Design an enzyme around this catalytic site. Structure first.
Site, mmCIF file in Angstrom:
data_model
loop_
_atom_site.group_PDB
_atom_site.id
_atom_site.type_symbol
_atom_site.label_atom_id
_atom_site.label_comp_id
_atom_site.label_asym_id
_atom_site.label_seq_id
_atom_site.Cartn_x
_atom_site.Cartn_y
_atom_site.Cartn_z
ATOM 1 C CE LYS A 141 56.450 91.726 26.205
ATOM 2 N NZ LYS A 141 57.344 91.147 27.520
ATOM 3 N NE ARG A 156 61.360 86.088 27.961
ATOM 4 C CZ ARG A 156 59.868 86.092 26.854
ATOM 5 N NH1 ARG A 156 59.334 86.743 25.899
ATOM 6 N NH2 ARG A 156 59.052 84.642 26.350
HETATM 7 C C1 LIG Z 1 57.563 84.738 29.493
HETATM 8 N N1 LIG Z 1 57.386 86.034 29.183
HETATM 9 C C2 LIG Z 1 56.504 86.494 28.198
HETATM 10 C C3 LIG Z 1 56.428 87.554 27.495
HETATM 11 N N2 LIG Z 1 57.041 88.221 27.851
HETATM 12 C C4 LIG Z 1 57.760 88.570 29.074
HETATM 13 C C5 LIG Z 1 57.627 87.373 29.626
HETATM 14 N N3 LIG Z 1 59.102 87.135 30.873
HETATM 15 C C6 LIG Z 1 60.165 88.247 31.223
HETATM 16 N N4 LIG Z 1 60.854 87.768 31.740
HETATM 17 N N5 LIG Z 1 59.581 89.205 30.526
HETATM 18 C C7 LIG Z 1 58.675 90.109 29.781
HETATM 19 O O1 LIG Z 1 58.485 90.932 29.433
#
Ligand SMILES: CN1CC=Nc2c1nc(N)[nH]c2=O
Ligand SMILES: CN1CC=Nc2c1nc(N)[nH]c2=O
Lengths: 269, 269
Positions: B215, B249
């Site tokens: 990010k 993630r």
């Molecule tokens: C679906 N996305 C896209 C980008 N970042 C994220 C995401 N979903 C979750 N749960 N946490 C994130 O940081």
């Protein structure tokens, strides 16, 4: 902030509050047909010190102990490297030695900091060398046995014995740095336990250096050889910094400088 | 230990105490001359899911939103990928969608977990989908503005509003996971502040997923482009785990699985 003094290293000064300080490990491979100070081996060391400087290192760690070597021969190796590196690379130099005489020639040859893996216990006169030249000295936790009653209580007791030897010799509190001696006199489980409880060292009131780079407790957790330990080293550096350590001693200076910098921003250092 | 239940994902079960769970991000590149489900794009996705499985991933995250796409077209993309991956790779699948209808077809096509970047606030009916199929749902922190009175107090208030929408729809406490929404509705300084204070999310009593991989707050700290953010991502994963997060993630599954594993051993997870 946390520290009301800077670490004074002669021509250089290290601020203990701005950032985690990166000590780069000089690779020091001896020439096989040589007595020390030869071109190939000093040139290799100088090129490596310049690379580590360019990659974010703040201190260059240099030791003299391939071939078996006596105190005299240890000096003939380390002294030309210290001379060339201190001339060619503008960073403070630490000398990795537990020997009073080696510490003395290394400082006379240009080293700024003493790095003692026996914490002034193998040769207490090293603390007198430190006290005379008024250099910082890293007192690492070590012992000749693994018989802990209670790991951290014992490490803190042993470090305090080192601090006492150093203060009685006239080392000033500002020139003392501690190190939990990860990978020394400790099982892989004790090293994990020392890492988990590192913040306890902060009660002693001194800056802490952590050295975990590529060590076998990481291979033991990840089941990976020494060349595949970068991510595991990174995890130990990050936890070390979160638990308050002021310096990390590492081989992979580029990668660890970027991890340290991210960690600093997140914790507000 | 900390959790007295496992996360139940139909055929698969995730233990929340043994280790940090790695959610791998499926790269989902659409075919330009295609309506979804074409060979090149589904084959690429399947090869990437197999690689991530081989590298230590525990969950595969799949989203349908290059070319602009409607709800119908979003379903035609994501559904064949979910079918092929769930047939060919034996891991639970999360569907990355804030749309009730997409969530529903994705689960009917084989997805196990709903990953909602709007925490049931964009389309509250997604929580009804979650409640009917009895799947876990990740409620991420997000808002349409950055006007915080007090960042963490506000994030916790907003997450609780999501939990309420989800519980009123009949989502069971065991099927709720939270996420601080790093990089969403937050300045680079707020993202650093949320990271520094992540442990506060633990008062809500639910498992936390952290998503920080690559990010821009990391590029902002290190001044590095998206392809040079591995070490910085690593630092955020390590702090996240030290502060109690149950899942991360990530794009770089191999490297982050090794860092997570080292971190787990040090903290006693
Ligand atoms: C679906 N996305 C896209 C980008 N970042 C994220 C995401 N979903 C979750 N749960 N946490 C994130 O940081
Ligand atoms: C000199 N060496 C060799 C190996 N490890 C270490 C070392 N010095 C310090 N201060 N800390 C270490 O972990």
């Amino acid at each position: 902030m946390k520290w009301d003094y800077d670490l004074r290293c002669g021509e250089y000064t290290l601020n203990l509050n701005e950032k985690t300080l990166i000590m780069g490990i000089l690779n020091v491979t001896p020439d096989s047909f040589s007595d020390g100070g030869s071109y190939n081996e000093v040139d290799a060391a100088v090129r490596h010190a310049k690379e580590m400087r360019d990659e974010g290192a703040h201190i260059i760690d240099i030791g003299g102990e391939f071939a078996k070597v006596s105190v005299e021969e240890e000096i003939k190796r380390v002294v030309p490297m210290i001379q060339a590196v201190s001339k060619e690379v503008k960073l403070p130099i630490s000398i990795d030695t537990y020997k009073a005489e080696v510490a003395k020639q290394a400082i006379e040859a240009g080293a700024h900091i003493i790095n003692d893996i026996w914490g002034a216990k193998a040769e207490p006169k090293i603390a007198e060398v430190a006290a005379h030249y008024d250099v910082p000295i890293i007192l690492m936790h070590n012992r000749d046995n693994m018989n802990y009653r209670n790991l951290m209580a014992d490490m803190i007791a042993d470090l305090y014995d080192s601090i006492k030897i150093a203060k009685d010799a006239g080392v000033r509190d500002e020139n003392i740095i501690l190190d939990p001696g990860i990978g020394f006199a400790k099982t892989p489980e004790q090293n994990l336990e020392a890492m988990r409880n590192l913040e306890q060292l902060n009660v002693l009131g001194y800056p802490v250096l952590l050295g975990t780079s590529r060590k076998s407790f990481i291979g033991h957790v990840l089941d990976l050889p020494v060349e595949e330990r970068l991510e595991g080293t990174g995890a130990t550096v990050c936890l070390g910094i979160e638990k308050g350590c002021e310096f990390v001693r590492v081989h992979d200076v580029k990668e660890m400088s970027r991890m340290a910098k991210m960690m600093d921003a997140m914790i507000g250092k």
